[PDB]
PDB file of C-alpha atoms in Angstrom:
ATOM      1  CA  UNK W   1      13.563 -78.483 -13.529  1.00 38.09           C
ATOM      2  CA  UNK W   2       9.801 -78.146 -13.982  1.00 39.04           C
ATOM      3  CA  UNK W   3       8.942 -79.837 -10.684  1.00 38.26           C
ATOM      4  CA  UNK W   4       8.846 -78.003  -7.371  1.00 35.86           C
ATOM      5  CA  UNK W   5      10.692 -79.619  -4.506  1.00 32.13           C
ATOM      6  CA  UNK W   6       9.886 -76.493  -2.504  1.00 28.37           C
ATOM      7  CA  UNK W   7       9.173 -76.869   1.253  1.00 30.03           C
ATOM      8  CA  UNK W   8       6.209 -74.564   1.985  1.00 32.28           C
ATOM      9  CA  UNK W   9       4.589 -77.205   4.169  1.00 34.83           C
ATOM     10  CA  UNK W  10       7.213 -77.506   6.771  1.00 33.83           C
ATOM     11  CA  UNK W  11       6.507 -73.834   7.262  1.00 33.84           C
ATOM     12  CA  UNK W  12       2.915 -74.856   7.650  1.00 32.87           C
ATOM     13  CA  UNK W  13       3.710 -77.449  10.277  1.00 33.02           C
ATOM     14  CA  UNK W  14       5.788 -74.715  11.990  1.00 34.91           C
ATOM     15  CA  UNK W  15       3.166 -72.024  11.795  1.00 35.03           C
ATOM     16  CA  UNK W  16       0.724 -74.361  13.495  1.00 35.39           C
ATOM     17  CA  UNK W  17       3.148 -74.627  16.448  1.00 33.81           C
ATOM     18  CA  UNK W  18       4.556 -71.131  16.314  1.00 33.17           C
ATOM     19  CA  UNK W  19       3.070 -68.455  14.040  1.00 30.71           C
ATOM     20  CA  UNK W  20       6.124 -66.180  14.488  1.00 30.41           C
ATOM     21  CA  UNK W  21       8.575 -68.899  13.478  1.00 30.18           C
ATOM     22  CA  UNK W  22       6.390 -70.193  10.665  1.00 33.32           C
ATOM     23  CA  UNK W  23       5.898 -66.897   8.782  1.00 38.29           C
ATOM     24  CA  UNK W  24       9.645 -66.235   8.974  1.00 38.85           C
ATOM     25  CA  UNK W  25      11.014 -69.644   7.790  1.00 37.65           C
ATOM     26  CA  UNK W  26       9.043 -69.257   4.587  1.00 36.79           C
ATOM     27  CA  UNK W  27      10.552 -65.827   4.193  1.00 35.77           C
ATOM     28  CA  UNK W  28      13.946 -67.301   5.003  1.00 35.79           C
ATOM     29  CA  UNK W  29      14.120 -69.775   2.089  1.00 39.43           C
ATOM     30  CA  UNK W  30      12.275 -67.248  -0.056  1.00 36.10           C
ATOM     31  CA  UNK W  31       8.675 -68.542  -0.317  1.00 34.34           C
ATOM     32  CA  UNK W  32       6.821 -65.778   1.474  1.00 33.94           C
ATOM     33  CA  UNK W  33       7.403 -62.101   0.875  1.00 38.24           C
ATOM     34  CA  UNK W  34       7.988 -59.428   3.485  1.00 40.15           C
ATOM     35  CA  UNK W  35       5.808 -56.284   3.976  1.00 41.29           C
ATOM     36  CA  UNK W  36       2.251 -56.954   5.049  1.00 42.10           C
ATOM     37  CA  UNK W  37       0.404 -57.589   1.796  1.00 44.38           C
ATOM     38  CA  UNK W  38       2.389 -60.823   1.452  1.00 45.34           C
ATOM     39  CA  UNK W  39       1.683 -62.236   4.895  1.00 46.78           C
ATOM     40  CA  UNK W  40      -1.904 -61.010   4.779  1.00 47.58           C
ATOM     41  CA  UNK W  41      -2.161 -62.593   1.352  1.00 48.51           C
ATOM     42  CA  UNK W  42      -1.017 -65.820   2.945  1.00 49.06           C
ATOM     43  CA  UNK W  43      -3.305 -66.256   5.912  1.00 50.93           C
ATOM     44  CA  UNK W  44      -6.181 -65.481   3.632  1.00 48.03           C
ATOM     45  CA  UNK W  45      -4.990 -67.518   0.674  1.00 47.96           C
ATOM     46  CA  UNK W  46      -3.338 -70.710   1.861  1.00 48.21           C
ATOM     47  CA  UNK W  47      -6.157 -72.459   3.705  1.00 45.63           C
ATOM     48  CA  UNK W  48      -4.456 -75.536   5.224  1.00 45.04           C
ATOM     49  CA  UNK W  49      -3.310 -73.733   8.423  1.00 41.11           C
ATOM     50  CA  UNK W  50      -4.982 -74.223  11.808  1.00 41.60           C
ATOM     51  CA  UNK W  51      -7.917 -71.764  12.092  1.00 43.04           C
ATOM     52  CA  UNK W  52      -7.109 -71.144  15.761  1.00 46.18           C
ATOM     53  CA  UNK W  53      -3.504 -70.350  14.885  1.00 47.92           C
ATOM     54  CA  UNK W  54      -4.526 -67.895  12.166  1.00 48.53           C
ATOM     55  CA  UNK W  55      -7.171 -66.276  14.261  1.00 46.52           C
ATOM     56  CA  UNK W  56      -4.683 -65.747  17.101  1.00 47.56           C
ATOM     57  CA  UNK W  57      -2.140 -64.253  14.721  1.00 44.43           C
ATOM     58  CA  UNK W  58      -4.146 -61.306  13.381  1.00 42.91           C
ATOM     59  CA  UNK W  59      -5.537 -60.672  16.860  1.00 42.34           C
ATOM     60  CA  UNK W  60      -2.172 -60.034  18.417  1.00 41.39           C
ATOM     61  CA  UNK W  61      -1.237 -56.855  20.244  1.00 42.21           C
ATOM     62  CA  UNK W  62       1.892 -56.295  18.105  1.00 40.95           C
ATOM     63  CA  UNK W  63       2.096 -53.072  15.981  1.00 42.09           C
ATOM     64  CA  UNK W  64       3.465 -55.313  13.170  1.00 42.20           C
ATOM     65  CA  UNK W  65       0.618 -57.753  13.626  1.00 41.98           C
ATOM     66  CA  UNK W  66      -2.073 -55.071  13.713  1.00 39.36           C
ATOM     67  CA  UNK W  67      -0.803 -54.093  10.276  1.00 40.86           C
ATOM     68  CA  UNK W  68      -0.782 -57.798   9.374  1.00 40.68           C
ATOM     69  CA  UNK W  69      -4.516 -57.848  10.279  1.00 41.93           C
ATOM     70  CA  UNK W  70      -5.569 -54.695   8.485  1.00 41.31           C
ATOM     71  CA  UNK W  71      -4.249 -56.090   5.174  1.00 40.16           C
ATOM     72  CA  UNK W  72      -6.156 -59.268   5.952  1.00 39.47           C
ATOM     73  CA  UNK W  73      -9.427 -57.342   6.149  1.00 40.12           C
ATOM     74  CA  UNK W  74      -8.519 -55.341   3.063  1.00 40.82           C
ATOM     75  CA  UNK W  75      -9.015 -58.352   0.830  1.00 43.92           C
ATOM     76  CA  UNK W  76     -12.402 -59.841   1.633  1.00 41.79           C
ATOM     77  CA  UNK W  77     -22.338 -54.030  -1.287  1.00 42.75           C
ATOM     78  CA  UNK W  78     -23.589 -57.365   0.276  1.00 42.19           C
ATOM     79  CA  UNK W  79     -25.672 -57.701   3.494  1.00 40.19           C
ATOM     80  CA  UNK W  80     -23.941 -56.795   6.742  1.00 39.18           C
ATOM     81  CA  UNK W  81     -24.227 -60.322   7.990  1.00 42.43           C
ATOM     82  CA  UNK W  82     -23.143 -61.528   4.568  1.00 43.38           C
ATOM     83  CA  UNK W  83     -19.818 -59.838   5.477  1.00 44.36           C
ATOM     84  CA  UNK W  84     -19.434 -60.843   9.117  1.00 46.32           C
ATOM     85  CA  UNK W  85     -19.743 -64.501   8.242  1.00 42.90           C
ATOM     86  CA  UNK W  86     -17.312 -64.001   5.356  1.00 44.96           C
ATOM     87  CA  UNK W  87     -14.920 -62.260   7.610  1.00 44.79           C
ATOM     88  CA  UNK W  88     -15.103 -65.026  10.241  1.00 49.34           C
ATOM     89  CA  UNK W  89     -14.820 -68.003   7.924  1.00 48.83           C
ATOM     90  CA  UNK W  90     -11.082 -67.804   7.326  1.00 48.32           C
ATOM     91  CA  UNK W  91     -10.208 -68.242  10.997  1.00 48.44           C
ATOM     92  CA  UNK W  92     -11.444 -69.330  14.379  1.00 44.07           C
ATOM     93  CA  UNK W  93     -12.847 -66.335  16.151  1.00 43.07           C
ATOM     94  CA  UNK W  94     -10.535 -65.973  19.237  1.00 41.65           C
ATOM     95  CA  UNK W  95     -12.205 -66.050  22.644  1.00 42.35           C
ATOM     96  CA  UNK W  96      -9.835 -63.466  24.148  1.00 42.51           C
ATOM     97  CA  UNK W  97     -11.482 -60.098  25.031  1.00 38.42           C
ATOM     98  CA  UNK W  98      -8.766 -57.713  23.736  1.00 36.58           C
ATOM     99  CA  UNK W  99      -8.394 -59.588  20.444  1.00 37.57           C
ATOM    100  CA  UNK W 100     -12.127 -59.611  19.489  1.00 40.02           C
ATOM    101  CA  UNK W 101     -12.039 -55.786  19.829  1.00 40.95           C
ATOM    102  CA  UNK W 102      -8.992 -55.467  17.562  1.00 37.05           C
ATOM    103  CA  UNK W 103     -10.965 -57.394  14.851  1.00 36.83           C
ATOM    104  CA  UNK W 104     -14.420 -55.777  15.155  1.00 35.72           C
ATOM    105  CA  UNK W 105     -12.868 -52.284  15.178  1.00 35.22           C
ATOM    106  CA  UNK W 106     -11.225 -52.845  11.750  1.00 34.50           C
ATOM    107  CA  UNK W 107     -14.213 -54.748  10.404  1.00 36.65           C
ATOM    108  CA  UNK W 108     -16.633 -51.921  11.282  1.00 34.08           C
ATOM    109  CA  UNK W 109     -14.290 -49.225   9.948  1.00 32.86           C
ATOM    110  CA  UNK W 110     -13.683 -51.184   6.687  1.00 31.84           C
ATOM    111  CA  UNK W 111     -17.407 -51.926   6.110  1.00 30.72           C
ATOM    112  CA  UNK W 112     -18.370 -48.333   6.633  1.00 27.93           C
ATOM    113  CA  UNK W 113     -16.118 -47.432   3.723  1.00 31.98           C
ATOM    114  CA  UNK W 114     -17.729 -48.742   0.549  1.00 31.97           C
ATOM    115  CA  UNK W 115     -28.873 -47.221   6.783  1.00 31.71           C
ATOM    116  CA  UNK W 116     -26.541 -47.168   9.804  1.00 27.93           C
ATOM    117  CA  UNK W 117     -25.196 -44.196  11.676  1.00 27.93           C
ATOM    118  CA  UNK W 118     -21.491 -44.577  12.489  1.00 26.60           C
ATOM    119  CA  UNK W 119     -18.780 -47.199  12.467  1.00 24.79           C
ATOM    120  CA  UNK W 120     -19.499 -47.606  16.166  1.00 26.46           C
ATOM    121  CA  UNK W 121     -22.960 -48.752  15.130  1.00 25.53           C
ATOM    122  CA  UNK W 122     -21.777 -51.663  13.047  1.00 21.70           C
ATOM    123  CA  UNK W 123     -19.230 -52.374  15.746  1.00 21.82           C
ATOM    124  CA  UNK W 124     -21.904 -53.139  18.402  1.00 19.08           C
ATOM    125  CA  UNK W 125     -24.144 -54.764  15.832  1.00 13.84           C
ATOM    126  CA  UNK W 126     -21.369 -57.224  14.991  1.00 12.41           C
ATOM    127  CA  UNK W 127     -21.186 -58.251  18.637  1.00 12.37           C
ATOM    128  CA  UNK W 128     -24.939 -58.706  19.032  1.00 10.38           C
ATOM    129  CA  UNK W 129     -24.730 -61.135  16.077  1.00 10.53           C
ATOM    130  CA  UNK W 130     -21.868 -62.961  17.715  1.00 10.39           C
ATOM    131  CA  UNK W 131     -24.119 -62.869  20.760  1.00 12.48           C
ATOM    132  CA  UNK W 132     -26.665 -64.810  18.650  1.00 16.24           C
ATOM    133  CA  UNK W 133     -24.616 -67.296  16.580  1.00 12.50           C
ATOM    134  CA  UNK W 134     -23.230 -68.566  19.922  1.00 13.59           C
ATOM    135  CA  UNK W 135     -26.553 -68.418  21.695  1.00 11.17           C
ATOM    136  CA  UNK W 136     -28.278 -70.383  18.889  1.00 12.55           C
ATOM    137  CA  UNK W 137     -27.323 -74.926  22.794  1.00 11.31           C
ATOM    138  CA  UNK W 138     -27.666 -75.709  26.532  1.00 11.76           C
ATOM    139  CA  UNK W 139     -30.348 -73.124  27.190  1.00 14.51           C
ATOM    140  CA  UNK W 140     -34.080 -73.910  27.119  1.00 14.37           C
ATOM    141  CA  UNK W 141     -35.159 -70.403  26.310  1.00 15.84           C
ATOM    142  CA  UNK W 142     -33.722 -68.788  23.174  1.00 14.09           C
ATOM    143  CA  UNK W 143     -33.358 -65.037  22.316  1.00 17.76           C
ATOM    144  CA  UNK W 144     -36.930 -63.648  22.238  1.00 20.09           C
ATOM    145  CA  UNK W 145     -38.429 -62.289  18.976  1.00 21.63           C
ATOM    146  CA  UNK W 146     -39.638 -59.491  21.265  1.00 20.43           C
ATOM    147  CA  UNK W 147     -36.247 -59.338  22.931  1.00 21.83           C
ATOM    148  CA  UNK W 148     -33.014 -58.727  21.023  1.00 22.37           C
ATOM    149  CA  UNK W 149     -34.826 -55.677  19.648  1.00 21.17           C
ATOM    150  CA  UNK W 150     -35.593 -54.189  23.031  1.00 22.96           C
ATOM    151  CA  UNK W 151     -32.083 -55.227  23.968  1.00 26.25           C
ATOM    152  CA  UNK W 152     -30.467 -53.550  20.889  1.00 27.23           C
ATOM    153  CA  UNK W 153     -32.328 -50.322  21.528  1.00 23.95           C
ATOM    154  CA  UNK W 154     -30.165 -47.273  21.045  1.00 21.99           C
ATOM    155  CA  UNK W 155     -27.619 -48.277  18.505  1.00 25.11           C
ATOM    156  CA  UNK W 156     -28.061 -45.411  15.958  1.00 27.68           C
ATOM    157  CA  UNK W 157     -27.019 -42.432  18.124  1.00 26.17           C
ATOM    158  CA  UNK W 158     -30.144 -42.408  20.179  1.00 22.62           C
ATOM    159  CA  UNK W 159     -32.549 -44.395  18.052  1.00 22.17           C
ATOM    160  CA  UNK W 160     -32.968 -48.029  17.125  1.00 23.77           C
ATOM    161  CA  UNK W 161     -32.203 -49.769  13.864  1.00 26.18           C
ATOM    162  CA  UNK W 162     -35.252 -50.535  11.706  1.00 26.36           C
ATOM    163  CA  UNK W 163     -37.099 -53.314  13.587  1.00 28.31           C
ATOM    164  CA  UNK W 164     -37.462 -54.998  10.234  1.00 27.16           C
ATOM    165  CA  UNK W 165     -33.649 -55.170   9.858  1.00 30.08           C
ATOM    166  CA  UNK W 166     -32.888 -56.734  13.240  1.00 28.16           C
ATOM    167  CA  UNK W 167     -35.629 -59.242  12.392  1.00 26.12           C
ATOM    168  CA  UNK W 168     -34.293 -60.117   8.961  1.00 24.85           C
ATOM    169  CA  UNK W 169     -30.945 -60.498  10.752  1.00 23.32           C
ATOM    170  CA  UNK W 170     -32.348 -62.773  13.429  1.00 23.54           C
ATOM    171  CA  UNK W 171     -33.864 -65.300  11.011  1.00 25.53           C
ATOM    172  CA  UNK W 172     -30.658 -65.658   8.996  1.00 26.23           C
ATOM    173  CA  UNK W 173     -28.219 -66.774  11.636  1.00 28.86           C
ATOM    174  CA  UNK W 174     -30.686 -68.939  13.469  1.00 28.09           C
ATOM    175  CA  UNK W 175     -30.798 -71.039  10.311  1.00 27.97           C
ATOM    176  CA  UNK W 176     -27.099 -70.941   9.351  1.00 29.95           C
ATOM    177  CA  UNK W 177     -24.868 -70.555  12.428  1.00 30.46           C
ATOM    178  CA  UNK W 178     -21.820 -68.962  10.805  1.00 34.15           C
ATOM    179  CA  UNK W 179     -19.416 -70.762  13.141  1.00 33.44           C
TER     180      UNK W 179
END
């Protein structure tokens, strides 16, 4: 008929318990395609899935999952921070050390693709920003206007990033704390 008595929500309840079982059930009944552009076009598209469960998926050590994360980045000119926040809005940034690296490696290599010095420069810049959207709630002193610049010294090979850039960056996230 014209209706759609299609599951596609049971898979959602399943993905939120087990990502590996959820993204396979959908492919079992024929709702989700194979490859990686399908699955990556699912975590990014269908926003009704736990953000912690989506953020843990793409930050998995699997060689099939690392591909499932690269296609995720390859979907979504603008300010650097205007890209970090956009990257981190779809999921809950995972607190695991090895996972954060897997994400900021592909985000820095994808940005530096379409000021700065290398992809390693955006890489460490991304982390200083995550070291500021988390810093700006139980601490009396905040990150100094004088600091954060003296602290980020030596990020372009041997030199600093324009002090006007780190400043324009500072004022943005202290107003709107991405996450």
